[PDB]
């Protein structure tokens, strides 16, 4: 039953530099340990990324300012998260997301994942909900309520969960999830990377490459995506200051380095700085 409780006030926009985030593995092996220029779209380095609060944390508690704005998707999305509890466990893609154009839905289970395309009739509030199930049964949703109804589900798919939580997080290390969502040709591609972080709430300096998870053939156009989170009915939504960062990809981050094992340890962006363009031209880092 679609119950609406979200407020109607915007959040004061926040920004922060990416610090080189958004480089992922293209194609097959390259163990040369030598540069390999590529022409593919990534997230440009040192480009500031917004910072949305799913449950706006203001005052004594953030639960009084529920807010999950609908964000445009554009060419591609870099989605970064650090929420302790999996309040955000879903995703929605589409051009209008209103009972038309065969919108796309993705949902994550506690032990699985389901992707579907049923031309959903989305309810005005994209939530899921969770309930208690009477005898000898713990919290679990009786029914999804992301959308009013599903229509013919042209594409179906089920598999193991994308998000991993088996890692033992302590008071120092908190998991950070990064996802690159792209839609090229007839293929929707998701490149994910999970890694602990402890330095700060922001993204620490360093390097890391996102391996591909799946490559779903979906013949749909994506313009606006609204991060879907299974609002936990803590009658009465709640979240441990859940927040997510959204960046928009651009078609230039070219040079890619490799190490002995075959990992992308470092990379360069030719259009960032004149020095970087010089480094690209010589095909050398120094």
């Amino acid at each position, epitope marked *: 039953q679609c119950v609406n409780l979200t407020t109607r006030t915007q959040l004061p926009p926040a920004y922060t530099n990416s610090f080189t985030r958004g480089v992922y593995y293209p194609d097959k092996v390259f163990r040369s340990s030598v540069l390999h220029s590529t022409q593919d779209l990534f997230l440009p380095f040192f480009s500031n990324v917004t910072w949305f609060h799913a449950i706006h944390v203001s005052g004594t508690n953030g639960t009084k300012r529920f807010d999950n704005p609908v964000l445009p998707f554009n060419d591609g999305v870099y989605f970064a998260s650090t929420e302790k509890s999996n309040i955000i466990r879903g995703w929605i893609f589409g051009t209008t997301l209103d009972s038309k154009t065969q919108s796309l839905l993705i949902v994550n289970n506690a032990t699985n994942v389901v992707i579907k395309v049923c031309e959903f009739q989305f309810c005005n509030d994209p939530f899921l909900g969770v309930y*208690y199930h009477k005898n000898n049964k713990s919290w679990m949703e009786s029914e999804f309520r992301v959308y009013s109804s599903a229509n013919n589900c042209t594409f179906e798919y089920v598999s193991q969960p994308f998000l991993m939580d088996l890692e033992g997080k302590q008071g120092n290390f908190k998991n950070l999830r990064e996802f690159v969502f792209k839609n090229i040709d007839g293929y929707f591609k998701i490149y994910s990377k999970h890694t602990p972080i402890n330095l700060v709430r922001d993204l620490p300096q360093g390097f890391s490459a996102l391996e591909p998870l799946v490559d779903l053939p979906i013949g749909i156009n994506i313009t606006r995506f609204q991060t879907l989170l299974a609002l936990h009915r803590s009658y009465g939504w709640t979240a441990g200051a859940a927040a997510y960062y959204v960046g928009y990809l651009q078609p230039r981050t070219f040079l890619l380095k490799y190490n002995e094992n075959g990992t992308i340890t470092d990379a360069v962006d030719c259009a960032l700085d004149p020095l970087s363009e010089t480094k690209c031209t010589l095909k050398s880092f120094t």
Partner: antibody
Amino acid sequence: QVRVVQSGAEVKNPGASVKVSCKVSGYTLTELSIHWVRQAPGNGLEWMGGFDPEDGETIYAQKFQGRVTMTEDTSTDTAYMELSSLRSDDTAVYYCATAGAITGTPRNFYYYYGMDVWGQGTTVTVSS
Amino acid sequence: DIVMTQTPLSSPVTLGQPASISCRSSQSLVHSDGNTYLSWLQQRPGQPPRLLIYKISNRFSGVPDRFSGSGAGTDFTLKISRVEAEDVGVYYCMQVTQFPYTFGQGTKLEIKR
């Protein structure tokens, strides 16, 4: 906020089956467990039926045992108790309440409200 | 069986004075969780019993500042600062400690006349 709704009245005879309804709104019936509890006009409540959270089923009263069953549907969320051989102890407003368990995101601890929410209630009449 | 019985049957009282009811028990009401539990229901004339408290520590939603927990041992007490007219109906004292849920006969509240 929590509310409860119930039936209006019943007209029966001794030694015959009767059916009395109950429902928990505000907090869905799933959020708690209904205890079918009965009383006379201004009398103590008899624990005719208790939906034990531990057992997840209705247990009957010792005073009036061997006199009741139940029938419930989940799609329509309609819960009825099929009692029998009502009395003046039953000839009153049937108030049904539910015991709820409240916990944070984890299941650290479960409360037992016993009887959290109450409704208008159902009457009963027994005539020879 | 915890024998619950409210000693008084009627309570005519003049406005502006603390008043309460005793609720004796044959055996102790201590709960396995280690915290005691109490319950009080107020039934206004021709009205459903409104749960005054599901727990003495945490009273039910919509209880006047008058009603406050108190008592001596087995006897309980709903202390009142200044009595109000609406409380002129039946009263019930309940314990949610045990599964049988045995109740007393009940008490009626009236206006002095």
